[PDB]
Amino acid sequence: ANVWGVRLADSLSSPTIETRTRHYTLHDFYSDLDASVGKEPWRPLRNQRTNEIVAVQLFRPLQGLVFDTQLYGFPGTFSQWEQFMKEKLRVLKYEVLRIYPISTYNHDRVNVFVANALVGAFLSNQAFYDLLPLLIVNDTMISDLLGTGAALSQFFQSHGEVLEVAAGRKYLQMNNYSNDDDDPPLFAKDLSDYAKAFYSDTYEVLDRFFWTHDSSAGVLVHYDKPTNGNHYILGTLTQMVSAPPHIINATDALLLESCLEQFAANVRARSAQPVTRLDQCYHLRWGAQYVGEDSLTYRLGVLSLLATNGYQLARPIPKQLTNRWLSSFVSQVVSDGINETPLWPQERYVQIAYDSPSVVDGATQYGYVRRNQLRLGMRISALQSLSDTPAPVQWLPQYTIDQVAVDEGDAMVSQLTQLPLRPDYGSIWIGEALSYYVDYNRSHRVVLSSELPQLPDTYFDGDEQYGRSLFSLARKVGDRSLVKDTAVLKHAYQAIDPNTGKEYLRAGQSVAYFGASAGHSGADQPLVIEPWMQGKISGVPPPSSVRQFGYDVAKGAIVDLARPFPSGDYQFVYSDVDQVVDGHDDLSISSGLVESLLDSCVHATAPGGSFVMKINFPTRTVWHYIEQKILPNVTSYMLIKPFVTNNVEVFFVAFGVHQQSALTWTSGVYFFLVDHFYRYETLSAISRQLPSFGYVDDGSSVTGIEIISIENPGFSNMTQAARVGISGLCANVGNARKSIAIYESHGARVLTITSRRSPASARRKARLRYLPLIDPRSLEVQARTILPSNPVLFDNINGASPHVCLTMMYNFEVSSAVYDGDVVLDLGTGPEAKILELIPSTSPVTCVDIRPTAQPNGCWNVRTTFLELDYLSDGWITGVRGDIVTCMLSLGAAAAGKSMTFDAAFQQLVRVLTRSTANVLLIQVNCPTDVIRTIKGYLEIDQTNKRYKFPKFGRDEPYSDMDSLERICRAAWPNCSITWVPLSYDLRWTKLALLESTTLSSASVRIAELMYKYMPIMRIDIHG
Amino acid sequence: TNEIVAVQLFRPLQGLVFDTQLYGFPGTFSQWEQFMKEKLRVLKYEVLRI
Amino acid sequence: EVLLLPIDHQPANVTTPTLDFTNELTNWRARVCELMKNLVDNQRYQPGW
Ligand SMILES: C[S@@+](CC[C@H](N)C(=O)[O-])C[C@H]1O[C@@H](n2cnc3c(N)ncnc32)[C@H](O)[C@@H]1O
């Protein structure tokens, strides 16, 4: 590297091959004075925002615009200006072709000075005719200027073998230019006289002139291939204004333009395109004994020396320059940190590197000196830039072998903390409700009212209300009542009653509705009435007439539904009003409203029909009353619970009212209700731990996000402090997903490391003593601009895949089965073993896989072990011992790799586990439990050839069945006791998915259940 | 009419205590907001210089 | 200890005063003059001059 602002050299390039240039012909003079469409002496420049022409660039046929544009009088639009220039060049064209014939002067030379001053005197109307016959040059180039035809000091004056000219107006400002930073810069090249040029023969005569001439403002040379012979540049005190912070004079403007041109040429050098000049920089000659150290001209002289040497910048320069980027470059160059290169500018001669790729010292002779004593440890090849993307991209770390303290990582992340900012929340739960249903069976069992579990007594807590409000606010739906009513009708029209052989209900039942909210932003009724009358549910029969009741209707009447108001009796009624709003926050008044509302609903049912109840708060009186009253007088019933909100409500459905029947509650209903209250308790304990909806994160909670911000100067090997910071965030994050972004933050290129913390990451971070450190190379290679995004709490939007769901299932049952202080063994650990995140922090591992992993070896509190030995073999468990075997997904993987069956793989594995010392074990087998279903797009079946063929993973393996597994297991161990685990229908596993901040998309978890019943596991003790 | 008749400003600016005749803002919201944009751009360049 | 006054009183920043127009009496005089400018500018009262 960083000279004052950083540059990315790493090698250095230069244009090697060179175009030798042609010279003037008068045929070419007429050709480019005729402003053709293909070529013309001007070229427009435009804005980068509107693409409107705000400046023009002109060249060789005209340079003599040194007079004032008030004297010239050009218009303001580019089209009128260019046709004006066309017709004035046409008039002067006719004049000069009058005075010179093309036939005799077909191929004779000219003074370019006389040509430019001729077109300038014609545009300024300043009596060009004395200048006219000096057009065709004599034997030499400059003696016609020394022996003057007419002395014209308004254009050029002589000084005794030294010619002074006033080169002006390389560019020309159009009036729509308004010093916008997105507008292109001008470098003070549009003023009257930005500098003066001293054309003469030899540098010795020119320096003998400079003995007497002033050299206050510095003098600039070109030294490579001058425009019209060897000369100098004498800038004046006119300054550049178009950079808003910085005000630079003329000489700094010219040197900055030339050095940026050399920076452009150093990138485009591809060893095949010869350019028009070998180098570009100017090399200040006599001002070094005038101005001194730590001046802007001196610093740009240093940069021009490095540019002539052939260095390349850090930031990729634009093709079209802007005042914004130019002022940013000037702010970077006047910053700090004086030098790291061994190079310094000189006045005696110019210097190029000993290993420079430029050949300009051998190309032209005078002025260019090769140096031998100065050497560079850098490379030779070119450099390329990477293609920027507007989206944030993922990154994955790789661990080295060194380690520092986790307290050092804490100190560095406290230094680099950018925690207090509000993230975007998202949604924890998308999709639809879940079918949780049970029917009444007559010959099933019998239970009593007092046996039923209830709501927990810690229901009205502020923390419970906090969790349920967090869940109901995080969850994303359309209309919840729409979802609930569609679910309850699709479960209501399923089975048949024992009296009639046909079905439950038919088409045209003349139904009634209770408790209409009637506010749904349009269609002022519940949103199932019109699609259910049209039959859009496609699993129901359409009714005949619909009446909506309740004290919030729009079309019906408003009636207190608790007190019995008699109305017309209908074959089917549907209650939807709660007992909370009509209640006054008491379980007693809630139960009494259930009593009265159910009594009115029974007495208004048109007997032989059915009704549906919803119950928010069931109590002993509620269950005992409905068992003593309704269950005798009903034919059949139904109780279901679709689930979009964390609540204790269920949907009770009756069938065949007012017929007596010996009928009580059953143990299947009991298991359903036990599991319902249990999954309520588990999901409430999940929602109690999660932070709120609209909070700000500060790294205080165990779950949440974390970001830090560092800046990277060039491709420099960055410091150990930032390395400890990034590796400490890696140890904080625990091998989860992370995204980065690279963008110029407000004048400096910044780096962001965006990911999320978890309690499993916390136990991982507490597991290891020292944190390992990472490879900086994977971050230091990137040179593209990764545009950032807002911080979101949830990366995933569409929902977790069912394979992520089964991985979460498996991780949960392994973490539940493992205990604290235990040696384990993981068969098929995968790329990164999640068993490090599952087990407690004090229990060691003996884990091994065929896949070579990159886990941090060493610097642990309790020891780890990582190796590869082709685990389906013997001899090694006699070496290393364990207590409990965890073989997840490696059975089918090894069987598909070795093309062998599950029977042979399992008997070999149970043989080498008879070699083992473990008493308990649990492995991932692939056994069908239910009748196979050939799940669409995830799991199809195969009867004969006995395969599965996952199409999502593109994977395939056989399956073995539980009786053959029992045969092999009892042939190995005559003492073992096997327990097949049931499927996690109580949703205990859901905390490990929620605390990792990932939504679920409940169709995926339905497919996950239907899949987990096709590859379960078991628990086998060696005793029993 | 849903036409912008008032604006609400906050934390980066509160020092408008002087008279709007001394300030001189235009009457349309679009011209006013681009005027505020360019004046904040000029003061932005000044404070980033210093 | 406190004294009541009809006009706002900002204290002197500097001890060498010099003229500026940033106060209430100049604003008052300017708005009165602005209304009389409107009063002579209206086409109903006098175009007659
Ligand atoms: C949860 S809402 C049902 C919303 C309805 N499903 C819908 O489609 O919008 C319960 C409704 O029943 C009404 N309600 C509550 N208690 C009631 C009572 N004792 N008698 C009549 N209506 C009642 C409330 O006004 C509320 O609109």
Side-chain angles (χ1 to χ4, degrees), chain A residues 492 504-505 572-573 598 601-602 605 609-613 630 633-639 651-658:
Chain A
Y504 283 158
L505 275 303
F572 180 72
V573 296
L598 189 143
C601 185
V602 165
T605 319
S610 296
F611 63 93
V612 177
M613 291 295 290
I630 307 301
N633 292 317
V634 75
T635 302
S636 177
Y637 65 94
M638 183 72 73
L639 71 163
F651 287 160
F652 181 75
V653 181
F655 291 102
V657 299
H658 298 90

PDB file of all heavy atoms in Angstrom, chain A residues 492 504-505 572-573 598 601-602 605 609-613 630 633-639 651-658:
ATOM      1  N   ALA A 492     -64.464 -34.520   8.069  1.00  0.00           N
ATOM      2  CA  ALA A 492     -65.833 -34.780   8.485  1.00  0.00           C
ATOM      3  C   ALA A 492     -66.562 -35.684   7.506  1.00  0.00           C
ATOM      4  O   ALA A 492     -67.448 -36.442   7.906  1.00  0.00           O
ATOM      5  CB  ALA A 492     -66.588 -33.461   8.644  1.00  0.00           C
ATOM      6  N   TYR A 504     -71.846 -40.711   5.929  1.00  0.00           N
ATOM      7  CA  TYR A 504     -72.250 -39.773   6.976  1.00  0.00           C
ATOM      8  C   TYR A 504     -73.346 -38.826   6.502  1.00  0.00           C
ATOM      9  O   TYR A 504     -74.482 -38.875   6.983  1.00  0.00           O
ATOM     10  CB  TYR A 504     -71.034 -38.961   7.434  1.00  0.00           C
ATOM     11  CG  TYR A 504     -70.082 -39.693   8.342  1.00  0.00           C
ATOM     12  CD1 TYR A 504     -68.757 -39.282   8.463  1.00  0.00           C
ATOM     13  CD2 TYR A 504     -70.499 -40.793   9.071  1.00  0.00           C
ATOM     14  CE1 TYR A 504     -67.880 -39.945   9.293  1.00  0.00           C
ATOM     15  CE2 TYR A 504     -69.637 -41.449   9.910  1.00  0.00           C
ATOM     16  CZ  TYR A 504     -68.329 -41.034  10.009  1.00  0.00           C
ATOM     17  OH  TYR A 504     -67.465 -41.701  10.846  1.00  0.00           O
ATOM     18  N   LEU A 505     -73.012 -37.957   5.552  1.00  0.00           N
ATOM     19  CA  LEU A 505     -73.890 -36.893   5.093  1.00  0.00           C
ATOM     20  C   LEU A 505     -73.898 -36.873   3.573  1.00  0.00           C
ATOM     21  O   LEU A 505     -73.060 -37.492   2.916  1.00  0.00           O
ATOM     22  CB  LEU A 505     -73.460 -35.516   5.624  1.00  0.00           C
ATOM     23  CG  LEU A 505     -73.916 -35.031   7.005  1.00  0.00           C
ATOM     24  CD1 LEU A 505     -75.432 -35.042   7.101  1.00  0.00           C
ATOM     25  CD2 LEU A 505     -73.278 -35.783   8.159  1.00  0.00           C
ATOM     26  N   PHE A 572     -77.565 -29.781   9.889  1.00  0.00           N
ATOM     27  CA  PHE A 572     -76.178 -29.686  10.314  1.00  0.00           C
ATOM     28  C   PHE A 572     -75.877 -28.263  10.752  1.00  0.00           C
ATOM     29  O   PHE A 572     -76.194 -27.311  10.036  1.00  0.00           O
ATOM     30  CB  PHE A 572     -75.230 -30.108   9.192  1.00  0.00           C
ATOM     31  CG  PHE A 572     -73.790 -30.033   9.570  1.00  0.00           C
ATOM     32  CD1 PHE A 572     -73.253 -30.947  10.456  1.00  0.00           C
ATOM     33  CD2 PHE A 572     -72.973 -29.054   9.037  1.00  0.00           C
ATOM     34  CE1 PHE A 572     -71.925 -30.882  10.814  1.00  0.00           C
ATOM     35  CE2 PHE A 572     -71.641 -28.983   9.386  1.00  0.00           C
ATOM     36  CZ  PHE A 572     -71.116 -29.900  10.276  1.00  0.00           C
ATOM     37  N   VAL A 573     -75.280 -28.119  11.933  1.00  0.00           N
ATOM     38  CA  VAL A 573     -74.847 -26.822  12.427  1.00  0.00           C
ATOM     39  C   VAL A 573     -73.364 -26.907  12.759  1.00  0.00           C
ATOM     40  O   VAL A 573     -72.821 -27.980  13.029  1.00  0.00           O
ATOM     41  CB  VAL A 573     -75.659 -26.342  13.652  1.00  0.00           C
ATOM     42  CG1 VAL A 573     -77.112 -26.120  13.278  1.00  0.00           C
ATOM     43  CG2 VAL A 573     -75.578 -27.348  14.768  1.00  0.00           C
ATOM     44  N   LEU A 598     -72.985 -25.783  24.090  1.00  0.00           N
ATOM     45  CA  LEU A 598     -73.213 -27.148  23.652  1.00  0.00           C
ATOM     46  C   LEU A 598     -74.652 -27.575  23.894  1.00  0.00           C
ATOM     47  O   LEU A 598     -75.204 -28.331  23.091  1.00  0.00           O
ATOM     48  CB  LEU A 598     -72.218 -28.073  24.353  1.00  0.00           C
ATOM     49  CG  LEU A 598     -72.096 -29.536  23.937  1.00  0.00           C
ATOM     50  CD1 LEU A 598     -70.644 -29.955  24.009  1.00  0.00           C
ATOM     51  CD2 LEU A 598     -72.905 -30.406  24.871  1.00  0.00           C
ATOM     52  N   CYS A 601     -76.627 -25.987  21.114  1.00  0.00           N
ATOM     53  CA  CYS A 601     -76.286 -26.665  19.873  1.00  0.00           C
ATOM     54  C   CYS A 601     -76.912 -28.051  19.794  1.00  0.00           C
ATOM     55  O   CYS A 601     -77.265 -28.505  18.701  1.00  0.00           O
ATOM     56  CB  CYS A 601     -74.768 -26.753  19.746  1.00  0.00           C
ATOM     57  SG  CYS A 601     -74.192 -27.436  18.194  1.00  0.00           S
ATOM     58  N   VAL A 602     -77.065 -28.731  20.932  1.00  0.00           N
ATOM     59  CA  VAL A 602     -77.743 -30.023  20.939  1.00  0.00           C
ATOM     60  C   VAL A 602     -79.241 -29.840  20.728  1.00  0.00           C
ATOM     61  O   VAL A 602     -79.856 -30.528  19.906  1.00  0.00           O
ATOM     62  CB  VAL A 602     -77.427 -30.786  22.237  1.00  0.00           C
ATOM     63  CG1 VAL A 602     -78.389 -31.944  22.440  1.00  0.00           C
ATOM     64  CG2 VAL A 602     -76.022 -31.336  22.160  1.00  0.00           C
ATOM     65  N   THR A 605     -80.549 -29.045  16.674  1.00  0.00           N
ATOM     66  CA  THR A 605     -79.768 -29.885  15.772  1.00  0.00           C
ATOM     67  C   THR A 605     -80.611 -30.626  14.732  1.00  0.00           C
ATOM     68  O   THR A 605     -80.036 -31.177  13.784  1.00  0.00           O
ATOM     69  CB  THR A 605     -78.940 -30.882  16.609  1.00  0.00           C
ATOM     70  OG1 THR A 605     -78.418 -30.184  17.737  1.00  0.00           O
ATOM     71  CG2 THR A 605     -77.702 -31.393  15.864  1.00  0.00           C
ATOM     72  N   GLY A 609     -79.256 -35.608  12.823  1.00  0.00           N
ATOM     73  CA  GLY A 609     -78.208 -34.854  12.171  1.00  0.00           C
ATOM     74  C   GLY A 609     -76.901 -34.896  12.932  1.00  0.00           C
ATOM     75  O   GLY A 609     -76.608 -35.850  13.663  1.00  0.00           O
ATOM     76  N   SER A 610     -76.101 -33.845  12.763  1.00  0.00           N
ATOM     77  CA  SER A 610     -74.760 -33.808  13.329  1.00  0.00           C
ATOM     78  C   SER A 610     -74.373 -32.369  13.629  1.00  0.00           C
ATOM     79  O   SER A 610     -74.999 -31.423  13.145  1.00  0.00           O
ATOM     80  CB  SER A 610     -73.742 -34.438  12.375  1.00  0.00           C
ATOM     81  OG  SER A 610     -74.007 -35.812  12.169  1.00  0.00           O
ATOM     82  N   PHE A 611     -73.327 -32.212  14.441  1.00  0.00           N
ATOM     83  CA  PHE A 611     -72.776 -30.891  14.711  1.00  0.00           C
ATOM     84  C   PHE A 611     -71.292 -31.004  15.022  1.00  0.00           C
ATOM     85  O   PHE A 611     -70.767 -32.085  15.301  1.00  0.00           O
ATOM     86  CB  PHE A 611     -73.520 -30.173  15.846  1.00  0.00           C
ATOM     87  CG  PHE A 611     -73.441 -30.856  17.184  1.00  0.00           C
ATOM     88  CD1 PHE A 611     -72.455 -30.520  18.104  1.00  0.00           C
ATOM     89  CD2 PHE A 611     -74.391 -31.792  17.545  1.00  0.00           C
ATOM     90  CE1 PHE A 611     -72.402 -31.136  19.335  1.00  0.00           C
ATOM     91  CE2 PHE A 611     -74.341 -32.406  18.781  1.00  0.00           C
ATOM     92  CZ  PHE A 611     -73.344 -32.078  19.673  1.00  0.00           C
ATOM     93  N   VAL A 612     -70.622 -29.855  14.977  1.00  0.00           N
ATOM     94  CA  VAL A 612     -69.195 -29.748  15.246  1.00  0.00           C
ATOM     95  C   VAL A 612     -68.991 -28.709  16.338  1.00  0.00           C
ATOM     96  O   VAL A 612     -69.492 -27.585  16.232  1.00  0.00           O
ATOM     97  CB  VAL A 612     -68.401 -29.362  13.984  1.00  0.00           C
ATOM     98  CG1 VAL A 612     -66.927 -29.180  14.310  1.00  0.00           C
ATOM     99  CG2 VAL A 612     -68.584 -30.396  12.895  1.00  0.00           C
ATOM    100  N   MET A 613     -68.252 -29.086  17.376  1.00  0.00           N
ATOM    101  CA  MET A 613     -67.897 -28.187  18.461  1.00  0.00           C
ATOM    102  C   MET A 613     -66.410 -27.869  18.424  1.00  0.00           C
ATOM    103  O   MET A 613     -65.587 -28.698  18.027  1.00  0.00           O
ATOM    104  CB  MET A 613     -68.238 -28.803  19.818  1.00  0.00           C
ATOM    105  CG  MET A 613     -69.715 -28.934  20.080  1.00  0.00           C
ATOM    106  SD  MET A 613     -70.525 -27.337  20.184  1.00  0.00           S
ATOM    107  CE  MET A 613     -69.825 -26.786  21.732  1.00  0.00           C
ATOM    108  N   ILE A 630     -73.931 -36.539  26.391  1.00  0.00           N
ATOM    109  CA  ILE A 630     -73.992 -36.531  24.936  1.00  0.00           C
ATOM    110  C   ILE A 630     -73.672 -37.902  24.363  1.00  0.00           C
ATOM    111  O   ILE A 630     -74.420 -38.424  23.534  1.00  0.00           O
ATOM    112  CB  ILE A 630     -73.042 -35.449  24.386  1.00  0.00           C
ATOM    113  CG1 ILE A 630     -73.351 -34.105  25.046  1.00  0.00           C
ATOM    114  CG2 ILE A 630     -73.171 -35.349  22.878  1.00  0.00           C
ATOM    115  CD1 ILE A 630     -74.763 -33.628  24.825  1.00  0.00           C
ATOM    116  N   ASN A 633     -76.486 -40.103  24.210  1.00  0.00           N
ATOM    117  CA  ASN A 633     -77.523 -39.696  23.275  1.00  0.00           C
ATOM    118  C   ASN A 633     -77.009 -39.451  21.864  1.00  0.00           C
ATOM    119  O   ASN A 633     -77.744 -38.895  21.043  1.00  0.00           O
ATOM    120  CB  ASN A 633     -78.218 -38.440  23.797  1.00  0.00           C
ATOM    121  CG  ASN A 633     -79.017 -38.708  25.051  1.00  0.00           C
ATOM    122  OD1 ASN A 633     -79.713 -39.718  25.152  1.00  0.00           O
ATOM    123  ND2 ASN A 633     -78.909 -37.812  26.025  1.00  0.00           N
ATOM    124  N   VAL A 634     -75.783 -39.855  21.552  1.00  0.00           N
ATOM    125  CA  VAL A 634     -75.222 -39.664  20.225  1.00  0.00           C
ATOM    126  C   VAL A 634     -74.970 -41.040  19.612  1.00  0.00           C
ATOM    127  O   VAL A 634     -74.833 -42.047  20.313  1.00  0.00           O
ATOM    128  CB  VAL A 634     -73.935 -38.803  20.281  1.00  0.00           C
ATOM    129  CG1 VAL A 634     -72.746 -39.593  20.816  1.00  0.00           C
ATOM    130  CG2 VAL A 634     -73.631 -38.124  18.953  1.00  0.00           C
ATOM    131  N   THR A 635     -74.957 -41.088  18.280  1.00  0.00           N
ATOM    132  CA  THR A 635     -74.667 -42.332  17.576  1.00  0.00           C
ATOM    133  C   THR A 635     -73.166 -42.578  17.467  1.00  0.00           C
ATOM    134  O   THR A 635     -72.677 -43.641  17.860  1.00  0.00           O
ATOM    135  CB  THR A 635     -75.302 -42.312  16.185  1.00  0.00           C
ATOM    136  OG1 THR A 635     -76.715 -42.126  16.304  1.00  0.00           O
ATOM    137  CG2 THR A 635     -75.025 -43.612  15.455  1.00  0.00           C
ATOM    138  N   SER A 636     -72.429 -41.610  16.933  1.00  0.00           N
ATOM    139  CA  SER A 636     -70.978 -41.684  16.855  1.00  0.00           C
ATOM    140  C   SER A 636     -70.428 -40.275  16.981  1.00  0.00           C
ATOM    141  O   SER A 636     -71.176 -39.298  17.015  1.00  0.00           O
ATOM    142  CB  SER A 636     -70.511 -42.333  15.550  1.00  0.00           C
ATOM    143  OG  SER A 636     -69.096 -42.341  15.472  1.00  0.00           O
ATOM    144  N   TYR A 637     -69.105 -40.170  17.051  1.00  0.00           N
ATOM    145  CA  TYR A 637     -68.487 -38.859  17.168  1.00  0.00           C
ATOM    146  C   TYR A 637     -67.099 -38.887  16.544  1.00  0.00           C
ATOM    147  O   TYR A 637     -66.656 -39.898  15.992  1.00  0.00           O
ATOM    148  CB  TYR A 637     -68.442 -38.392  18.627  1.00  0.00           C
ATOM    149  CG  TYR A 637     -67.579 -39.214  19.555  1.00  0.00           C
ATOM    150  CD1 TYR A 637     -66.253 -38.863  19.801  1.00  0.00           C
ATOM    151  CD2 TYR A 637     -68.096 -40.314  20.221  1.00  0.00           C
ATOM    152  CE1 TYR A 637     -65.465 -39.605  20.656  1.00  0.00           C
ATOM    153  CE2 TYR A 637     -67.315 -41.055  21.083  1.00  0.00           C
ATOM    154  CZ  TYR A 637     -66.000 -40.698  21.296  1.00  0.00           C
ATOM    155  OH  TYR A 637     -65.217 -41.435  22.155  1.00  0.00           O
ATOM    156  N   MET A 638     -66.412 -37.753  16.656  1.00  0.00           N
ATOM    157  CA  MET A 638     -65.123 -37.525  16.023  1.00  0.00           C
ATOM    158  C   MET A 638     -64.461 -36.349  16.723  1.00  0.00           C
ATOM    159  O   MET A 638     -65.132 -35.375  17.069  1.00  0.00           O
ATOM    160  CB  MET A 638     -65.296 -37.229  14.527  1.00  0.00           C
ATOM    161  CG  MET A 638     -64.015 -37.046  13.730  1.00  0.00           C
ATOM    162  SD  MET A 638     -63.084 -38.557  13.458  1.00  0.00           S
ATOM    163  CE  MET A 638     -64.120 -39.352  12.238  1.00  0.00           C
ATOM    164  N   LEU A 639     -63.153 -36.443  16.939  1.00  0.00           N
ATOM    165  CA  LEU A 639     -62.396 -35.319  17.479  1.00  0.00           C
ATOM    166  C   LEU A 639     -61.078 -35.221  16.728  1.00  0.00           C
ATOM    167  O   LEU A 639     -60.303 -36.181  16.679  1.00  0.00           O
ATOM    168  CB  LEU A 639     -62.191 -35.440  19.000  1.00  0.00           C
ATOM    169  CG  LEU A 639     -61.289 -36.439  19.731  1.00  0.00           C
ATOM    170  CD1 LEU A 639     -61.040 -35.965  21.150  1.00  0.00           C
ATOM    171  CD2 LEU A 639     -61.898 -37.829  19.735  1.00  0.00           C
ATOM    172  N   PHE A 651     -61.257 -29.883  17.873  1.00  0.00           N
ATOM    173  CA  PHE A 651     -62.502 -29.784  17.124  1.00  0.00           C
ATOM    174  C   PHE A 651     -63.292 -31.068  17.324  1.00  0.00           C
ATOM    175  O   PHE A 651     -62.954 -32.111  16.752  1.00  0.00           O
ATOM    176  CB  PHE A 651     -62.222 -29.520  15.647  1.00  0.00           C
ATOM    177  CG  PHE A 651     -61.741 -28.125  15.365  1.00  0.00           C
ATOM    178  CD1 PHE A 651     -61.053 -27.838  14.199  1.00  0.00           C
ATOM    179  CD2 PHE A 651     -61.965 -27.105  16.276  1.00  0.00           C
ATOM    180  CE1 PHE A 651     -60.608 -26.553  13.942  1.00  0.00           C
ATOM    181  CE2 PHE A 651     -61.524 -25.823  16.026  1.00  0.00           C
ATOM    182  CZ  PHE A 651     -60.844 -25.545  14.859  1.00  0.00           C
ATOM    183  N   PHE A 652     -64.339 -30.991  18.136  1.00  0.00           N
ATOM    184  CA  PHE A 652     -65.187 -32.133  18.441  1.00  0.00           C
ATOM    185  C   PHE A 652     -66.352 -32.177  17.465  1.00  0.00           C
ATOM    186  O   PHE A 652     -67.071 -31.187  17.307  1.00  0.00           O
ATOM    187  CB  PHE A 652     -65.705 -32.057  19.874  1.00  0.00           C
ATOM    188  CG  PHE A 652     -66.574 -33.211  20.258  1.00  0.00           C
ATOM    189  CD1 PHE A 652     -66.016 -34.451  20.520  1.00  0.00           C
ATOM    190  CD2 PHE A 652     -67.948 -33.061  20.358  1.00  0.00           C
ATOM    191  CE1 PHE A 652     -66.812 -35.522  20.874  1.00  0.00           C
ATOM    192  CE2 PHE A 652     -68.751 -34.126  20.711  1.00  0.00           C
ATOM    193  CZ  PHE A 652     -68.182 -35.359  20.970  1.00  0.00           C
ATOM    194  N   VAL A 653     -66.541 -33.326  16.823  1.00  0.00           N
ATOM    195  CA  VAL A 653     -67.588 -33.520  15.827  1.00  0.00           C
ATOM    196  C   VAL A 653     -68.510 -34.619  16.334  1.00  0.00           C
ATOM    197  O   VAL A 653     -68.035 -35.653  16.815  1.00  0.00           O
ATOM    198  CB  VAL A 653     -66.994 -33.898  14.458  1.00  0.00           C
ATOM    199  CG1 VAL A 653     -68.083 -34.084  13.413  1.00  0.00           C
ATOM    200  CG2 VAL A 653     -65.969 -32.867  14.011  1.00  0.00           C
ATOM    201  N   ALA A 654     -69.816 -34.396  16.240  1.00  0.00           N
ATOM    202  CA  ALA A 654     -70.808 -35.396  16.606  1.00  0.00           C
ATOM    203  C   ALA A 654     -71.417 -36.023  15.357  1.00  0.00           C
ATOM    204  O   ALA A 654     -71.286 -35.500  14.248  1.00  0.00           O
ATOM    205  CB  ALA A 654     -71.907 -34.779  17.469  1.00  0.00           C
ATOM    206  N   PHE A 655     -72.082 -37.161  15.551  1.00  0.00           N
ATOM    207  CA  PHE A 655     -72.756 -37.864  14.464  1.00  0.00           C
ATOM    208  C   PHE A 655     -73.990 -38.569  14.996  1.00  0.00           C
ATOM    209  O   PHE A 655     -73.889 -39.357  15.937  1.00  0.00           O
ATOM    210  CB  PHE A 655     -71.837 -38.895  13.801  1.00  0.00           C
ATOM    211  CG  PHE A 655     -70.722 -38.292  13.020  1.00  0.00           C
ATOM    212  CD1 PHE A 655     -69.441 -38.240  13.542  1.00  0.00           C
ATOM    213  CD2 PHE A 655     -70.956 -37.769  11.760  1.00  0.00           C
ATOM    214  CE1 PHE A 655     -68.414 -37.680  12.818  1.00  0.00           C
ATOM    215  CE2 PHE A 655     -69.935 -37.205  11.033  1.00  0.00           C
ATOM    216  CZ  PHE A 655     -68.658 -37.163  11.560  1.00  0.00           C
ATOM    217  N   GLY A 656     -75.140 -38.316  14.372  1.00  0.00           N
ATOM    218  CA  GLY A 656     -76.352 -39.014  14.751  1.00  0.00           C
ATOM    219  C   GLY A 656     -76.873 -38.609  16.113  1.00  0.00           C
ATOM    220  O   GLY A 656     -76.774 -39.376  17.074  1.00  0.00           O
ATOM    221  N   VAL A 657     -77.394 -37.399  16.218  1.00  0.00           N
ATOM    222  CA  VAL A 657     -77.827 -36.877  17.507  1.00  0.00           C
ATOM    223  C   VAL A 657     -79.188 -37.452  17.877  1.00  0.00           C
ATOM    224  O   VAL A 657     -79.982 -37.845  17.013  1.00  0.00           O
ATOM    225  CB  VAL A 657     -77.855 -35.339  17.470  1.00  0.00           C
ATOM    226  CG1 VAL A 657     -76.467 -34.817  17.191  1.00  0.00           C
ATOM    227  CG2 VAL A 657     -78.813 -34.870  16.408  1.00  0.00           C
ATOM    228  N   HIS A 658     -79.433 -37.511  19.193  1.00  0.00           N
ATOM    229  CA  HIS A 658     -80.696 -37.951  19.798  1.00  0.00           C
ATOM    230  C   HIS A 658     -81.044 -39.393  19.431  1.00  0.00           C
ATOM    231  O   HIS A 658     -82.181 -39.700  19.066  1.00  0.00           O
ATOM    232  CB  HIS A 658     -81.852 -37.011  19.452  1.00  0.00           C
ATOM    233  CG  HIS A 658     -81.665 -35.610  19.948  1.00  0.00           C
ATOM    234  ND1 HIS A 658     -81.047 -34.633  19.197  1.00  0.00           N
ATOM    235  CD2 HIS A 658     -82.017 -35.022  21.115  1.00  0.00           C
ATOM    236  CE1 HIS A 658     -81.027 -33.503  19.881  1.00  0.00           C
ATOM    237  NE2 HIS A 658     -81.610 -33.712  21.049  1.00  0.00           N
TER     238      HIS A 658
END
